[PDB]
Write an enzyme that holds these catalytic residues in place. Sequence first.
Site, PDB file in Angstrom:
ATOM      1  N   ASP A 197      35.823  -1.080  41.689  1.00  0.00           N
ATOM      2  CA  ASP A 197      34.433  -1.462  41.913  1.00  0.00           C
ATOM      3  C   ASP A 197      34.340  -2.162  43.294  1.00  0.00           C
ATOM      4  O   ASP A 197      34.813  -1.580  44.259  1.00  0.00           O
ATOM      5  CB  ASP A 197      33.893  -2.305  40.742  1.00  0.00           C
ATOM      6  CG  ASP A 197      32.366  -2.348  40.717  1.00  0.00           C
ATOM      7  OD1 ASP A 197      31.745  -1.295  40.974  1.00  0.00           O
ATOM      8  OD2 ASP A 197      31.794  -3.423  40.452  1.00  0.00           O
ATOM      9  N   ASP A 243      38.914   3.256  40.680  1.00  0.00           N
ATOM     10  CA  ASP A 243      38.594   2.324  41.754  1.00  0.00           C
ATOM     11  C   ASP A 243      38.553   0.921  41.180  1.00  0.00           C
ATOM     12  O   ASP A 243      38.642   0.747  39.963  1.00  0.00           O
ATOM     13  CB  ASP A 243      37.227   2.659  42.359  1.00  0.00           C
ATOM     14  CG  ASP A 243      36.125   2.698  41.327  1.00  0.00           C
ATOM     15  OD1 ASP A 243      35.906   3.779  40.752  1.00  0.00           O
ATOM     16  OD2 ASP A 243      35.478   1.643  41.099  1.00  0.00           O
TER      17      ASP A 243
HETATM   18  C1  LIG Z   1      38.927  11.770  33.974  1.00  0.00           C
HETATM   19  C2  LIG Z   1      38.020  12.982  33.982  1.00  0.00           C
HETATM   20  C3  LIG Z   1      36.576  12.586  34.251  1.00  0.00           C
HETATM   21  C4  LIG Z   1      35.672  13.797  34.526  1.00  0.00           C
HETATM   22  N1  LIG Z   1      34.767  13.465  35.622  1.00  0.00           N
HETATM   23  C5  LIG Z   1      34.510  13.959  36.845  1.00  0.00           C
HETATM   24  C6  LIG Z   1      33.520  13.141  37.407  1.00  0.00           C
HETATM   25  C7  LIG Z   1      32.861  13.249  38.773  1.00  0.00           C
HETATM   26  C8  LIG Z   1      32.626  11.843  39.336  1.00  0.00           C
HETATM   27  C9  LIG Z   1      31.622  11.735  40.487  1.00  0.00           C
HETATM   28  S1  LIG Z   1      31.673  10.097  41.145  1.00  0.00           S
HETATM   29  C10 LIG Z   1      30.333   9.133  40.497  1.00  0.00           C
HETATM   30  C11 LIG Z   1      30.371   9.009  38.978  1.00  0.00           C
HETATM   31  C12 LIG Z   1      31.634   8.292  38.506  1.00  0.00           C
HETATM   32  N2  LIG Z   1      31.173   7.550  37.320  1.00  0.00           N
HETATM   33  C13 LIG Z   1      32.074   6.501  36.810  1.00  0.00           C
HETATM   34  C14 LIG Z   1      32.471   5.365  37.715  1.00  0.00           C
HETATM   35  C15 LIG Z   1      33.648   5.302  38.450  1.00  0.00           C
HETATM   36  N3  LIG Z   1      33.694   4.103  39.105  1.00  0.00           N
HETATM   37  C16 LIG Z   1      32.581   3.389  38.819  1.00  0.00           C
HETATM   38  C17 LIG Z   1      32.084   2.129  39.194  1.00  0.00           C
HETATM   39  N4  LIG Z   1      32.780   1.320  40.031  1.00  0.00           N
HETATM   40  N5  LIG Z   1      30.869   1.725  38.719  1.00  0.00           N
HETATM   41  C18 LIG Z   1      30.163   2.507  37.866  1.00  0.00           C
HETATM   42  N6  LIG Z   1      30.622   3.723  37.493  1.00  0.00           N
HETATM   43  C19 LIG Z   1      31.813   4.167  37.971  1.00  0.00           C
HETATM   44  C20 LIG Z   1      29.806   7.079  37.561  1.00  0.00           C
HETATM   45  C21 LIG Z   1      29.198   8.165  38.436  1.00  0.00           C
HETATM   46  O1  LIG Z   1      28.283   8.879  37.601  1.00  0.00           O
HETATM   47  N7  LIG Z   1      33.219  12.185  36.496  1.00  0.00           N
HETATM   48  N8  LIG Z   1      33.993  12.347  35.344  1.00  0.00           N
END
Ligand SMILES: CCCCn1cc(CCCSC[C@H]2CN(Cc3c[nH]c4c(N)ncnc34)C[C@@H]2O)nn1
EC number: 2.4.2.28
Lengths: 273, 273, 273
Positions: free
Chosen positions: B214, B212
């Site tokens: 942000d 994304d």
């Molecule tokens: C590439 C394989 C990664 C494995 N995997 C699956 C997952 C499930 C994700 C559930 S969504 C919420 C998570 C995502 N994660 C990263 C993230 C992404 N965009 C961000 C942003 N704009 N600001 C802060 N953090 C993020 C933070 C949250 O704990 N995370 N890592």
Amino acid sequence: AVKIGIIGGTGLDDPEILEGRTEKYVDTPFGKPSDALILGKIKNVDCVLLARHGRQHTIMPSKVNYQANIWALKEEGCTHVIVTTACGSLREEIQPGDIVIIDQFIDRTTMRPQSFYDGSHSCARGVCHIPMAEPFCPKTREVLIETAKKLGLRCHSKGTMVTIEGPRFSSRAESFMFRTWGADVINMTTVPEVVLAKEAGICYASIAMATDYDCWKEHEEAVSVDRVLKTLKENANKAKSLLLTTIPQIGSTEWSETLHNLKNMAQFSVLLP
Amino acid sequence: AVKIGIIGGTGLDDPEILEGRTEKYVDTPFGKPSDALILGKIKNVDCVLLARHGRQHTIMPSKVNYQANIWALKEEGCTHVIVTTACGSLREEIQPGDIVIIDQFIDRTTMRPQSFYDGSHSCARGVCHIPMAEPFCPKTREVLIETAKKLGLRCHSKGTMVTIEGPRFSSRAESFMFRTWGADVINMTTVPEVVLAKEAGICYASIAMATDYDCWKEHEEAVSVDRVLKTLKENANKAKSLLLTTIPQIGSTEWSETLHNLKNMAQFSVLLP
Amino acid sequence: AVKIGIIGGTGLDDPEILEGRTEKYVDTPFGKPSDALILGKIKNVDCVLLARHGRQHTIMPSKVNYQANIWALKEEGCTHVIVTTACGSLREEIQPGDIVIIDQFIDRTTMRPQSFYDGSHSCARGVCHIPMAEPFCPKTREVLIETAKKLGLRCHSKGTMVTIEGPRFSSRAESFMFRTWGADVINMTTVPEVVLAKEAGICYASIAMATDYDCWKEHEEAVSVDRVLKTLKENANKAKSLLLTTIPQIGSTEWSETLHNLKNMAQFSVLLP
Ligand SMILES: CCCCn1cc(CCCSC[C@H]2CN(Cc3c[nH]c4c(N)ncnc34)C[C@@H]2O)nn1
Ligand SMILES: CCCCn1cc(CCCSC[C@H]2CN(Cc3c[nH]c4c(N)ncnc34)C[C@@H]2O)nn1
Ligand SMILES: CCCCn1cc(CCCSC[C@H]2CN(Cc3c[nH]c4c(N)ncnc34)C[C@@H]2O)nn1
Ligand SMILES: [Cl-]
Ligand SMILES: [Cl-]
Ligand SMILES: [Cl-]
Ligand SMILES: [Cl-]
Ligand SMILES: [Cl-]
């Protein structure tokens, strides 16, 4: 009657320097201080020495009981606290070995109680919102600056200390960012020591000695514990000399109005029901 | 003998990929890891898989037992840790789906223990001030970068990760501010994982996948959980492939000098009485 | 059916204003709110009044039970929350006494639970990652802005609030730094109040009244508790008048789509196993 609390005084605890040496283990409402209080006279001024990380250093900056340390010094009757700290330089002009008589801070700590008035101690009831526009005692700083000049020491008359949580050193991206924020030097202990001293109505000042250039700077060795220790071995004598020469000047300066205004500031920062 | 700890390796726990699979629950002096350790061989390299937020589990990034996770991997004999993380992009050129082999961080966490040497664990005695000038293992990063190129992946060879406390996403004012600080991507888990690995003398590197932008574009749709999950579904195969192809390259590279220098850095960062 | 939660509602608890006044001491899964809920109708709109620091109480902003406060308001059926806060001005043009209808924040808090979904509560299972691109309800803000204009009040239509941990005020180096970050006003309570309201699916907006210029002017008198109290005494009616006139406008505006989108955003921010 002035009484100077000295934190990090390395190495004023010396029989040639400290007359009438006495040791005292105190308890406070916030727990035990980092070490025993060492009482005595240095150049005929009452002083109270307190090692910040203990006598044989076993405490990360995050876990130093700053509340207990300042409370204990206040309870001993300290009117002033002068601290010494190592620090990284975030400015080319602040070279390793230089002293910086810091006048501001930027807080990057996260884990640290910063008030005595925490709702859980009946010797500090209410809520305190202490002003921090001028965190360091101007008159003590002026004496430090003047004394350093007389001693021929490399010394910066102002500077902003960024205090990081630690115990890790900063990343390079952090180091560069702190420069853009206006920080000049970097350490792990100024906050909340300076804040708590102000709440206690104590005239607080800091002698910071640059020991490294953190990791922002081209062509230098980046900071490590060994780089810090090496610079201190080659330079720490300077801070001791500055302190030694400063102490009697503080002893013979007038303080009653300064201390009265500090007392008023502290008193009128407290809200009660 | 290389052994690779893998955090966030989701799809590598596959019988077609992981030979000699064993699962176990370990305990550490810092408590229980987030999940069981899954041991086995991937392309004839010993690996240890560890899910960061549990196998199904509901744990905020703030509450992940990073100390236990890294300690457990160290205790299994891991020489390397490679982590995968989703992240937001703070730069137009880092598009969703792109990989970033991050080389710096900015810490915006507040709740998190960042050292093993906390004064309460006799297997980590003293105070450790680990250098963070170069937080990520350069040789592992070079292999990751080279491998991504061979795979044809859109991949950025450096980048600064800002790690926020969470679990909330950032405000727009925060997003803009992080851009001005030099942050390129944003997540919730890099710190203190990277710091603890360095203290343990482990070669640590991170694969960050942008999911994304942000919320720093006013016109474009801001980040949400659904936007992140959607991009991962459409792209996460890339990170798996990168890891799969990287593992045997790490297995066949020389490490003894890299690991010796990491060991020395970690050892000489510790202060004792 | 709109119901407006009001936090810090300066003198709305008045028998001339609040019809059908009822008092209620509630408990929540996160503990007790700061004060009793005061229920009633103001200009024929159901309202719930809640004092933030207690009626006769003395609690640091760090220790206010924001979770309980917002949970209690949610449990009473509040669709909207409008808060009033004092703040320091970080901009010359925001003069003491001015109202600022803030639209962004920067979090400088460190000690604070910011989520209901903490892994320990009945009513809030899973992990929530709430979007914060637009933390404050746009339609409520528009009504506040329009109403302030009609009342002839000095009012700024946007602004970024930096929320500091406190209870200390900021240093001058901090004050200057916050200005460079794009912060316009400064307080101790917006975060995590705004975050928790969004998690609960509530339309949240804030009326910020400047009481001082913090300490970023070197020539001018810095903030203190007495300076804040003095400005509040001199500006006592403005926020009340704005709220009084705003409440019926909120009552007669259409909300079903706004509230539906807030509900969806909150619901789909939650991850389950
Ligand atoms: C590439 C394989 C990664 C494995 N995997 C699956 C997952 C499930 C994700 C559930 S969504 C919420 C998570 C995502 N994660 C990263 C993230 C992404 N965009 C961000 C942003 N704009 N600001 C802060 N953090 C993020 C933070 C949250 O704990 N995370 N890592
Ligand atoms: C002239 C002051 C002498 C008092 N004294 C002794 C000592 C023992 C030194 C142990 S080394 C690690 C300490 C140093 N100390 C300051 C420091 C220096 N450089 C920094 C940098 N780049 N970033 C952050 N902090 C620093 C941090 C750590 O606690 N510190 N102060
Ligand atoms: C004149 C009677 C009014 C009744 N009353 C008292 C109070 C409590 C105010 C106590 S003063 C300290 C408060 C103010 N309040 C907001 C604030 C204002 N300026 C700030 C600044 N420069 N930095 C940070 N925060 C502020 C924070 C603190 O709790 N609110 N209403
Ligand atoms: Cl320090
Ligand atoms: Cl920060
Ligand atoms: Cl993350
Ligand atoms: Cl201005
Ligand atoms: Cl406030």
